[PDB]
């Protein structure tokens, strides 16, 4: 039984666009905005996140349109599941 976490609340799917260094990445989000996102230390010490990865972004409560935290990074098999379920589109992944 495959199970895949989903964005909740005001969280958004995003594709990592650029590594900015020191736990920061620009992420192209499913609402069509690029957000500058922090990777929390807890996540940094668990996973390797790279350009092109699909992630869940939590927008910050202030400047919500410009900033967020990355809270999850999907594996490739999870990405394929999300595609099949229509949660994201191939056009979105490629950009």
């Amino acid at each position: 039984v495959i199970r895949v976490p989903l964005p909740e609340g005001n969280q958004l799917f995003g594709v990592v666009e650029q590594a900015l260094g020191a736990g920061w990445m620009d992420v192209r989000c499913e609402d069509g905005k690029i957000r500058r996102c922090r990777i929390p230390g807890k996540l940094r010490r668990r996973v390797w996140i790279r350009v092109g990865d699909l992630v869940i972004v939590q927008p910050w409560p202030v400047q919500s349109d410009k900033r967020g935290d990355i809270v999850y990074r999907y594996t490739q098999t999870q990405v394929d599941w999300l595609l099949r379920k229509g949660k994201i589109t191939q056009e979105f992944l490629t950009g």
Binding site: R38, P40, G41, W60, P61, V62
Partner: peptide, 13 residues
């Protein structure tokens, strides 16, 4: 109104 990040061992708005 603006919210900023916390320091070195820390993170919280």
């Amino acid at each position: 109104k603006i919210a900023v990040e916390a320091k070195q061992p820390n993170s919280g708005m």
